[PDB]
From Swiss-Prot, chains A, C:
Originating gene: metN
Entry-linked CDD domains: ABC_MetN_methionine_transporter
Membrane topology: Peripheral membrane protein
Domain of life: Bacteria
Designated name of the protein: Methionine import ATP-binding protein MetN
Organism name: Escherichia coli (strain K12)
Keyword terms: Allosteric enzyme, Amino-acid transport, ATP-binding, Cell inner membrane, Cell membrane, Membrane, Nucleotide-binding, Translocase, Transport
Domain characteristics, as noted in the entry: Contains a regulatory C-terminal extension (C2) with a ferredoxin-like fold. The C2 domains from each MetN subunit in a transporter dimerize to form an eight-stranded beta sheet.
Swiss-Prot record, chain D:
Designated name of the protein: D-methionine transport system permease protein MetI
Family affiliation: Belongs to the binding-protein-dependent transport system permease family. CysTW subfamily.
Domain ABC transmembrane type-1: 13-204
Pfam families linked: BPD_transp_1
CDD domains cross-referenced by the UniProt entry: TM_PBP2 (cd06261)
Disruption phenotype: Disruption confers resistance to cellular contact-dependent growth inhibition (CDI) CdiA of E.coli strain MHI813, but not to several other tested CdiA toxins.
Sequence intervals crossing the membrane: 20-40, 58-78, 81-101, 152-172, 186-206
NCBIfam families listed in its UniProt record: PRK10782.1 (NF008049)
Lineage: Bacteria, Pseudomonadati, Pseudomonadota, Gammaproteobacteria, Enterobacterales
Biological function: Part of the binding-protein-dependent transport system for D-methionine and the toxic methionine analog alpha-methyl-methionine. Probably responsible for the translocation of the substrate across the membrane.
Cytoplasmic domain ranges by topology: 41-57, 102-151, 207-215
Main location: membrane
Source organism (scientific name): Escherichia coli (strain K12)
Compartments reported by the entry: Cell inner membrane
InterPro entries: AA_ABC_Transporter_Permease, MetI-like, MetI-like_sf
Length: 344, 216, 344, 215
């Protein structure tokens, strides 16, 4: 139980007008776990993450990091407490004047770290992220990932307990978003680092984090494991940003072959939405041989989170009508949403 | 031209440089702090304090709004009490500064604004004190701009020295004023005109190559 | 028919410096089709697309457009040819000075049309993409996709046959990109717009294109229709572009459990790569039927084009050893690449 | 103050205004043409012609580099023959326009470069001639930058006109030089300073709203 938030409420007032960014929000984070917080564009996710590091001072609330109250620290004591919280941002936010060595070494120089203690720590922290070689290269000629790697190396210059990623994947290309997220995870497994996230994209939530929260209109709507969130959508909001955000292709070459009602010597087209079944459940396999039906996968997308299958599939199903009916029903009874989208 | 009168142009180039580079120094001495004060006091920044920025901004606006020779002439009595003469090289720099400070104070604010906001959050995230931010984050990032701000303000001061030469505080300014305004002299007016132009190109070029040394 | 270019070559002149961005390349797009041209980082695709509209001047070649060549150096006769060839760029290139109404009007105001006549084509083209709602807003207000939507109506003001799209959906987010290309085909199949385009993402071509070609080092190293390009990807590079559309994972919950040498009581983790065999042959089910194994779909991405299923899949195959071996080899025999990633 | 002194300052406010506004107009008239020429004659732009930009830029660079009072005084012999007076407003505005043109020359070229490249291409995608683009895309897009550049070169001339007064010209430049330098009359001196500061805010604020309202 590392970082914890209790009834966080914050409002900024400009031009004799007050606005609620956060309204009574509590977030419990376990020690050494990755934690996502998704939300609507500027729904308070932007502000919420930085309440932990006290970049934004809370109007009402209590922030407990490593079992310590942050609001009571005032000025002098917070400087020491922020050593244990590293942070990296959407845009990579680093000094272009200093090289990667110096950029990672900067937070250590605030502690008056002597001589080569910084050389020992920087070189190895740079080796961790993947930047050896380029110790003397300036940020000017670094790529998005390369910059972000310096940023990760920089935030870990204090060997902190908690880490804060503000949309780190955002500016990175689909190829390099892989690497950086995997690097964060590799650290999570090695150092046992606690991590808080806020991401505008869903694919980030699937791959790394354990528990994901949904925050919209300045209040925490859902809090559960990723497994439970994508399986059972709970709120109508989360269901919108989860179900409507995944596929349903329905190719055109089949579209024109499609019918409304039955057809002489035909087969039903249907799609299977997986509601979070289980990986040990051999549904498509058992259904195929017990009922004697050919489930031909025309199109499919399904992802893994927390030991459960979920996604969508477009499939052709042949076999006897006596069988086909029962076949669909067996899956249905095992929690598989099945729509009949015409016949072929 | 005559040999001893050629040596008078040399007496002036000494002074004209002497004014700008000294007055420029005292400019940044007073101005760079007021510039950083302006950048920090912007609402939504490290120590916001919006009422202070309303005061300090209006101060440097009114001073910068005053045209130079109206300032210099208006400052004469203060220039006298502060220096004691009101005439000559020493008295010259005080009206050049104070006309120079608000000039660069505004450039220092703008040049410092070229820095992305993200660095200041990262600075605070790492846990640095506002002085540590200004010392080793803001300044060095703004440096390439601040060096240009030097180049810009230094050449304008050369121009001010010229106007300042009319009231008798300066070298190439006075030699240009005396021999061209009353009793024009084709030679030496062309020399002082070109000798100032080549002096600007020298400080322009020196400003470019010094920015290249500290560039991205 | 139309938009048919003949062996265009061009040299990049800075000076004494000489490098050929384009070297002897022809392309023919039938009237009413979407033709993609994919390439590497600025490998001449950026230069090529605009040789049709004659933004940049070719050194050697001919270009048939609507049954006529523009290579004749016709001065201002390109006007109506350029009115029949519209364009939309990566950067929306809108006029900040003018409203969303006028941006579409500007190309039409260039032709000295009456103010009422222009009001006809604009109001309809605004309602086309869904801009009838925000008709008075400036470019500064409009969102990423919404800014492109006006650009689409912009090029269509003078009612062209051909529409050139230079990386149209590059700076747009996945959901917006999805809506834009959807609107691109809608306008394609309605009036029968001829569309030549270029994208660094193979996705864009994969999402909707009738034909595709891969440009590399200034040469066109592949040319075929989309259905046959996926079925016959001959080029060693062209396969690597389609290879990036697979988005496989082997998630972190598994990779921890993953094992090199087989241990007591476990199953092989398989990764099935479907080359594009058939949608009719039901291999995944019939292999479970035949050898009594369970293909548990851990995660998969598979798509349909040209009468066949393809893509990748990740599964854990349960059951008897001899059966697993038979089944897994059966799939190989039936043209499915199978790879044991480890044991789990 | 005094009885007639007030009515003398009235001429000065006028004379100072008259010199600045006319210098601006005659400045923009001879500067904006060379300003758009300087934009297009960049090797990357439409006309290319990298040969002329090696000279056309340098000649503007050499003028703008000259301090105004050394220019004004050196330009006396030349101004004597043009207007045929050597003194006063009508004579003074020529040196003002000569010094202020290079200033706007580069600023217009700079402010016109703030427009996005590729808006130039989309303009060729529609098929307009290079004079139509300079008419209805380049100019009206950079307009908020031009009026900003107008505001700058208007107020700098108010300062040039001050120095104008110290050498032969009329305006508040002279009144300040006359009652401040030779002997210090606080009332008159402070008034010339206030008038000019008040004058610049009215140029500033007028320029601000024409820049704000054109957006």
């Amino acid at each position: 139980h590392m970082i914890k938030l209790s009834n966080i409420t914050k409002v900024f007032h400009q031009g004799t007008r007050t606005i609620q960014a956060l309204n009574n929000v509590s977030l419990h984070v376990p020690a050494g776990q990755i934690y996502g917080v998704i939300g609507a564009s500027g729904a308070g996710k932007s502000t919420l993450i930085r309440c932990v590091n006290l970049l934004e001072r809370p109007t009402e609330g209590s922030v407990l990091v490593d079992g310590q109250e942050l609001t009571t620290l005032s000025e002098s004591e917070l400087t020491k407490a922020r050593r244990q919280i590293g942070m990296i941002f959407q845009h990579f936010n680093l000094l272009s004047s200093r090289t990667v060595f110096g950029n990672v070494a900067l937070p250590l120089e605030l502690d008056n770290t002597p001589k080569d203690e910084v050389k020992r720590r920087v070189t190895e922290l740079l080796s961790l992220v993947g930047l050896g070689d380029k110790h003397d290269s300036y940020p000017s000629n670094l790529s998005g990932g390369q910059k972000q790697r310096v940023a990760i190396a920089r935030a870990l210059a204090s060997n902190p307990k908690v880490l804060l990623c503000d949309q780190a994947t955002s500016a990175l290309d689909p190829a390099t978003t892989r690497s950086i997220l995997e690097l964060l995870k590799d650290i999570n497994r090695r150092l046992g680092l606690t991590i808080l996230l806020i991401t505008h994209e869903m694919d980030v939530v699937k791959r790394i984090c354990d528990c994901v929260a949904v925050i919209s209109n300045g209040e925490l709507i859902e809090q559960d494991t990723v497994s439970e969130v994508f399986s059972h959508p709970k709120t109508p909001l989360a269901q919108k940003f989860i179900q409507s955000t995944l596929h349903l292709d329905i190719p055109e070459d089949y579209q024109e072959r499609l019918q409304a009602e039955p057809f002489t010597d035909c087969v039903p087209m249907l799609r299977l939405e997986f509601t979070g079944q289980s990986v040990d459940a051999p549904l498509l396999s058992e259904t195929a041989r017990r009922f004697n039906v050919n489930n031909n996968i025309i199109s499919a997308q399904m992802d893994y989170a927390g030991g459960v299958k979920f996604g969508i599939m477009l499939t052709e199903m042949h076999g006897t009508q006596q069988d086909t009916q029962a076949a669909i029903a067996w899956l249905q009874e095992h929690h598989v949403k099945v729509e009949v989208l015409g016949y072929v | 031209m005559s040999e001893p009168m050629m040596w008078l142009l040399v007496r002036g180039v000494w002074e004209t440089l002497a004014m700008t580079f000294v007055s420029g120094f005292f400019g940044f001495v007073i101005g760079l702090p007021v510039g950083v004060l302006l950048y920090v006091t912007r609402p939504g920044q490290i120590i916001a304090n919006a009422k202070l920025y309303r005061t300090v901004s209006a101060i440097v606006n009114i001073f910068r709004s005053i045209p130079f020779i109206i300032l210099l002439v208006w400052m004469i009595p203060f220039t006298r009490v502060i220096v004691g003469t009101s005439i000559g090289l020493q008295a010259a720099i005080v009206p050049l500064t104070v006309g120079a400070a608000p000039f660069i104070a505004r450039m220092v604010e703008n040049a410092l604004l070229e820095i992305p906001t993200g660095l200041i959050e990262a600075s605070r995230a790492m846990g640095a004190t506002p002085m540590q931010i200004v010392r080793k984050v803001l300044l060095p990032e703004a440096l390439p701009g601040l060096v240009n701000a030097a180049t810009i303000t230094l050449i304008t001061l050369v121009g001010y020295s010229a106007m300042g030469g009319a009231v008798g505080a300066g070298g190439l300014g006075q030699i240009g004023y005396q021999y061209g305004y009353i009793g024009y002299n084709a030679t030496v007016m062309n020399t002082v005109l070109v000798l100032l132009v080549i002096l600007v190109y020298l400080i322009q070029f020196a400003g470019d190559r010094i920015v290249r040394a500290v560039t991205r």
